Design a protein around this ligand. Structure first.
Ligand SMILES: [Ca+2]
Ligand code: NA
Length: 269
């Protein structure tokens, strides 16, 4: 039996699925620790930019988990992604330890742009700025990619980099009530929020696990972007971003929530 995680229902993905919108034909890159082969995922390619770790398989778990929130397959097992037919690309920029370099991440962003990705999910961040990262976020954007990035887990009223750069769509985390998760960074530049507490998804070893974080929120929005792109294949990254914001469920307090809670039903109505 397939389970639909609370957050998948909260963003109203099944409503989109019932309109025939699943992310089919939309290329989504997961820039993370890799993606491990899993019965509830279809991985269509990718690349590694981590020195000494040339496989795209996930030695950490984080990337696999993020990937299933985007695109776990719609079937009789496991969980269900926001965009269960999205074309997943594993872009390994973080090592098995969970950390990487500005150089790896920028290389992944270059790859995403050059390989025609429609969405790049960056469930990663740092408190310190990077001109290299900024340039790379702008590069992927110029090449037509919608870059979606986590706000961070410090609980502070400023958001992490690269989410703080204008051309990254910054995503915060809500709890099961739609209140800001205690850890979710907020403040200037936050675009939108999504479920980020007790999020069940795919995990290495053909298993499932629950995790907390803005890293879990971010893929809900990357998946929503993919639904919108399937519906509107002529739309740019900016049009998609704007529509997601304009159709989000307002939570008030934009400092805390940005435009509010991402709503895949409203976005595909
Ligand atoms: Ca499934
Ligand atoms: Na931003």
């Amino acid at each position: 039996a397939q389970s639909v995680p609370w957050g998948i229902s909260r963003v109203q993905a099944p409503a989109a699925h019932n309109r025939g919108l699943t992310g089919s034909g939309v290329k989504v890159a997961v820039l993370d620790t890799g993606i491990s082969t899993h019965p509830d995922l279809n991985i269509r390619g990718g690349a590694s930019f981590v020195p000494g770790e040339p496989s795209t398989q996930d030695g950490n778990g984080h990337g696999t988990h993020v990937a299933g929130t985007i695109a776990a397959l719609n079937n009789s097992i496991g969980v269900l992604g926001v965009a269960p037919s999205a074309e997943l690309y594993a872009v390994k920029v973080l090592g098995a330890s969970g950390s990487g370099s500005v150089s790896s991440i920028a290389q992944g962003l270059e790859w995403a742009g050059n390989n025609g990705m429609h969405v790049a999910n960056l469930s990663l961040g740092s408190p310190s700025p990077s001109a290299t990262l900024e340039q790379a976020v702008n590069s992927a954007t110029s090449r037509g990619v919608l870059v979606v990035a986590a706000s961070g887990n410090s609980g502070a009223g400023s958001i992490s980099y690269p989410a703080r750069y204008a051309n990254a769509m910054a995503v915060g985390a809500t709890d099961q009530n739609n209140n800001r998760a205690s850890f979710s960074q907020y403040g200037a530049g936050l675009d939108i929020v999504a479920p980020g507490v007790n999020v069940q998804s795919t995990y290495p070893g053909s298993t499932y696990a629950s995790l907390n974080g803005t890293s879990m929120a971010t893929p809900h929005v990357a998946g929503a972007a993919a639904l919108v792109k399937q519906k509107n294949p002529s739309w740019s990254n900016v049009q998609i971003r704007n529509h997601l914001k304009n159709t989000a469920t307002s939570l008030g307090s934009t400092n805390l929530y940005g435009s509010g809670l991402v709503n895949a039903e409203a976005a595909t109505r």
